[PDB]
Amino acid sequence: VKPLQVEPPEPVVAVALGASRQLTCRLACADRGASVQWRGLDTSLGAVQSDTGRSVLTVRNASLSAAGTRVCVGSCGGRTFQHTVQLLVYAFPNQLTVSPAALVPGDPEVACTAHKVTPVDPNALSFSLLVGGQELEGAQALGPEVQEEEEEDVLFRVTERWRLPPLGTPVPPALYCQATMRLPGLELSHRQAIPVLH
Numbered sequence: 001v002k003p004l005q006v007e008p009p010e011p012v013v014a015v016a017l018g019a020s021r022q023l024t025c026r027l028a029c030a031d032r033g034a035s036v037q038w039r040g041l042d043t044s045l046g047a048v049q050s051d052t053g054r055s056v057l058t059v060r061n062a063s064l065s066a067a068g069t070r071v072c073v074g075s076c077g078g079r080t081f082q083h084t085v086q087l088l089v090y091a092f093p094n095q096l097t098v099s100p101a102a103l104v105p106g107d108p109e110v111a112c113t114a115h116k117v118t119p120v121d122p123n124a125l126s127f128s129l130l131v132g133g134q135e136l137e138g139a140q141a142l143g144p145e146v147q148e149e150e151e152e153d154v155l156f157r158v159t160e161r162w163r164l165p166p167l168g169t170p171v172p173p174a175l176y177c178q179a180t181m182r183l184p185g186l187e188l189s190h191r192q193a194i195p196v197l198h
């Protein structure tokens, strides 16, 4: 095993807005002046270096400013070791709004808005329009519209819209909007019912 080890070891660690995470950097060293440094936001909270074999970095009540690349550097007997890990701070939406909130057969469009979300990158944040547990075939996605929420941290409001196909017979009792967020080691989802009236 390498002299320097970080737990957790993954190159990207995701932390929710308001949550906590602890990164422990351990350096095995027989010599006396072994040093462990946590840095990466040196222009900000700053770098911290100690004569030690163990240094723990803790993010508490994570804010978006906690995000960024951290590096643990260990020095033992003139040799230097490192581990680089990106902290990703995200906010999964705490509310979806569907418009219209209920559909009548024949309605041509439905919109689903995710509130207070970040990141908005479509490679992480996705929207699906389902009937049963399957994607509704023929639903044309008009593309996410992104805006800031009103005024730490600035979060976003993201709306997907679909032109609807005929819903067919038998008419489904509901559609569902699902917002899904995919990050390293994580898949988060929010499915909201859309009643179909009449």
Ligand SMILES: *[C@@H]1O[C@H](CO)[C@@H](O)[C@H](O)[C@H]1NC(C)=O
Binding pocket: 018, 061, 063, 152, 153
């Ligand atoms: C967490 O952070 C926010 C500031 O963004 C603060 O308003 C809230 O009270 C904090 N919670 C604690 C425990 O300090």
